[PDB]
Design a protein around this ligand. Structure first.
Ligand code: OAL
Lengths: 112, 112
């Protein structure tokens, strides 16, 4: 969604510490893989954008949800998200467990 | 811009450590209060979205830029960026210097 689209009521920013650029590509390819297309149909899901830190040490997902309830239950209570969490945690090259920060969009500076 | 727009070539995620929600509010109000009106017109600037972390301890800015070069030339090398940083670091309740992470968008999942 646009960054200031009013449907975004909740955001998660999830950082995955990795050992280098190869694992950054391998981690992204696993989270955007084709078998994860069920996420697209989760109610309240707006987007998940994976990035590779320029220094090669991390993968960061900026994810847009309609609400904290959509993330925690619609997504979080589905068995598939536990499945996905395990697979991401077992990938070789990870340096530690992912760390998420939860937040609410409060203001945006945009070009006219 | 849409989070997956191909024009987004460079992203900075900037975290400001604060002492609680009242300061989170004031820092977002400062950031969108007119101090960075000038940024809107800068070539390559796509957006800056300020969020309040739900735990009350930080304000995070997810900024989209057309490329790393436009960011360095049009924001980093412009002395008004130091002006901006002086303004945001002047607020009472700001507990440390901002931390930034530079990255490039690599994959995204959008609804369907
Ligand atoms: O829970 C953690 O602590 C780590 C963690 C691992 C994988 C995922 C998440 C996550 O948070 C997400 O948030 C997440 C999201 O918001 C939107 C889409 C996908 C994921 C996702 O695949």
């Amino acid at each position: 969604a646009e960054v200031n689209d009013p449907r975004v009521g909740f955001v998660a920013v999830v950082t995955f510490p990795v050992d280098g650029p190869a694992t950054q590509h391998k981690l992204v390819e696993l989270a955007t893989g084709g078998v994860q297309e069920w996420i697209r149909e989760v109610p309240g899901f707006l987007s998940a954008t994976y990035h590779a830190s320029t220094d090669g040490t991390a993968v960061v997902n900026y994810a847009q949800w309609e609400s904290e309830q959509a993330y925690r239950v619609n997504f979080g209570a589905d068995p598939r998200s536990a499945e996905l969490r395990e697979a991401l945690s077992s990938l070789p090259g990870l340096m530690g467990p992912p760390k998420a920060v939860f937040m609410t969009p409060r203001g945006a500076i945009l070009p006219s």
